[PDB]
Symmetry: C2
Subunit: 63 residues, 2 copies
């Protein structure tokens, strides 16, 4: 029964895409929808999943 990550604030500047290593979407248990980007420096950053660059970034990570 470990913790579960969630978001409450979203970054507001598009992050240069090349800094970004991976992503995951936050569990639906969270009071809000969330995308957590993991930078290539093991930093974790919340982003607004309803935002365009955010889903662009997510899509590329896969395709």
């Amino acid at each position: 029964d470990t913790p579960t990550a969630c978001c409450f604030s979203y970054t507001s500047r598009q992050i240069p895409q090349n800094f970004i290593a991976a992503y995951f979407e936050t569990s639906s248990q969270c009071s809000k929808p969330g995308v957590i980007f993991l930078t290539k420096r093991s930093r974790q950053v919340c982003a607004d999943p309803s935002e365009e660059w955010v889903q662009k970034y997510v899509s590329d990570l896969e395709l």
Copy 2:
């Protein structure tokens, strides 16, 4: 690091010898929470309502 994900607990006694540190979960969350980080660096959700939890935090803080 800004706008990081915040950890919430959605599920909830540990031998006191595995305890290495504790963390209270953000008020933004939906359930109150204490997270104990064990020496094996594994994270465990616990009820701040249970008495051993509050006892542990005291043992930690007061030492």
